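Re: export button greyed out
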Amino acid sequence: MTYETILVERDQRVGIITLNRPQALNALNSQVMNEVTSAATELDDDPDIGAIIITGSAKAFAAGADIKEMADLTFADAFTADFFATWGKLAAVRTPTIAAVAGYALGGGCELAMMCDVLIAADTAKFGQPQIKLGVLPGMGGSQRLTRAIGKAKAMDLILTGRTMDAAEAERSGLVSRVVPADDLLTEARATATTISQMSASAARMAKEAVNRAFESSLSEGLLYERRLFHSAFATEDQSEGMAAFIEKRAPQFTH
Amino acid sequence: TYETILVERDQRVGIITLNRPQALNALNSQVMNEVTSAATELDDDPDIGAIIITGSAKAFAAGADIKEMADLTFADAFTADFFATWGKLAAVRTPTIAAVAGYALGGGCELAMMCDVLIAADTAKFGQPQIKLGVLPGMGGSQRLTRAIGKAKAMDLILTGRTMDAAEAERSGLVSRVVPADDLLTEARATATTISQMSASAARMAKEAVNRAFESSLSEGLLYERRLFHSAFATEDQSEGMAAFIEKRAPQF
Amino acid sequence: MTYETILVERDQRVGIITLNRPQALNALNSQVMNEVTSAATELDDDPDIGAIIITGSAKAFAAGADIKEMADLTFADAFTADFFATWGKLAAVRTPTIAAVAGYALGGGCELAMMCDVLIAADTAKFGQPQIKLGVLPGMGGSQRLTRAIGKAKAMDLILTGRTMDAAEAERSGLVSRVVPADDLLTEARATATTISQMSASAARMAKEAVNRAFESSLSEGLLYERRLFHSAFATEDQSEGMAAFIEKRAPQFT
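Workaround output, generated via the alternate export path:
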């Protein structure tokens, strides 16, 4: 399809969604929400895609949101619209997703990055939750996902003060998978996406789903769910080919 | 008037300074009741938007009065629900800052973890040495420490009683920031001032949403936050904050 | 007893379980699972044991599993056996366990290490979750314990790419307790075990159980659990002696 705020690219088994509002420093709005989730969902249902990247510009992954949509928003309209709920569709994506974050990832932007499974950051990446300064708070999962990544003391710090966090701090805290030089961000993200998309598709979906369990229940239930999923893998051809390949000292030819 | 603490107000920030220097600010029952009383009074004061808790340069709080526990029987502890009063600190709705220098050991460390924001001096030494006394943490240590720095390190700290310096606390998830010892009180006031200057309802909601991350599934935490966020739009502070932003000025809440 | 795939030694109040499959880099398999859990269980019930070390060789804590064993498994075989469930027995051990990890700890090996309470890593340690490459996923708690230790973005990365993590990253990410020089792994692990085993046995077991609570319920419930366990500690002679010793400024003499 054609979109207005994003560009969508397919190369091999990798899909890439590039936020495209340069005049706004890739600020999120309701239209961006709708377009990204439509794109991501459409990519998720494509058998020829095994990984999805979401990225912005070198200057901004996403520097926040259009204040106009929130400025004269009333509680009635927010409640009626369930304002931001549509973002949940990105989390419902079963194929692995990778946020490639360069420069500014602030408010909504940082929240969008955290929605992704894998987070590769440029060395220029700046994260933060400055929503408090506008007299509000995170509304796209920030108080949940940030706190679960970096712990209470830092989560409370960023959310109550709005201070920024650079890439190196993001990396030692739990917020990002790894950090790479800014000129190599897109190349690294593609390489990570490539590797992931060459794994067995069900095994990757299963592995991602199992990790996601770790934030939804007791440890004891997470362990049970994982083990059962693990057992199910043995009904898949790819488990059989994967192990055979290992033993026979050769490359696995996955069928998906 | 208090015996074991000093309480001070300035603008919209309140400071509770632990005041038992002859005993390294070691916690006891009086300290528990006074700190929690002062914090609760500050929480109900609408002229207060942030609360600092700190000790001295040498020790935030080093352990506790052991004679208060030595001869306790199970029946005594159960009847008294020993340490339950500390729960009043976590119920404080206004943001709290632990400004930790020097020794934060046992209860001292647990008191620091109860606060929302933790600013440590470079001299801060954290530890859970309760095991050495033949008991364990009883003020949230096994729960808050583990959730901050992970199982491997919490197990290490709680079972060997080894201490952890400010740098390790910072890379592990225990403190928000580390600052030079001479700047601790200054920096915490700066952080407190900043928080106290935000919308009171907005910061209470933010804090409360963050606390949810430890009480339920992510699924439920996400829904709660989104509902809280929705409700913020029924506040006048929200209209002010966004209007102040457009006009590139400071909000007048 | 005597074992085929492991070695067991006892000194003072510390027990050591050494993985012993050098021909296969200590790769896990059903026998290792059964023997390791049997040994741990026996050490757990020995009153004269206060700490338990699990370790491998300097080249590998445990590099992967016998893929040969899982290769021809159908879903039915895995379902019937409840494949890997027996590992649960290790975490049911009440005495503190310490994983001393040198070299390779990949897949099941990394999962094994994470099951332990304390993890001492040699600077040569290499952690990974490469299960995905075989067209499966972590089956021994990897997706669960790794995620809880290092956070979502890093666990996703490891589990979805199979990349390795060195001891230094592991230490700053939350995965390990401490990193020491390779030549001193065993020495330092035994010092840590000696310290833990010299604590009150009951107090150590309680603190360990309290800590485990932090992954099984909400924070409010974990708080109440720990306070009540704390209350009951006052019914132990060790509480009474340990506090008396501290107050009397003398060394404690436990039971």
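Strands of chain C lie at 6-11, 14-19, 51-55, 60-63, 97-101, 104-106, 118-122, 126-128, 164-166, 178-180. The button fix ships in the next patch.
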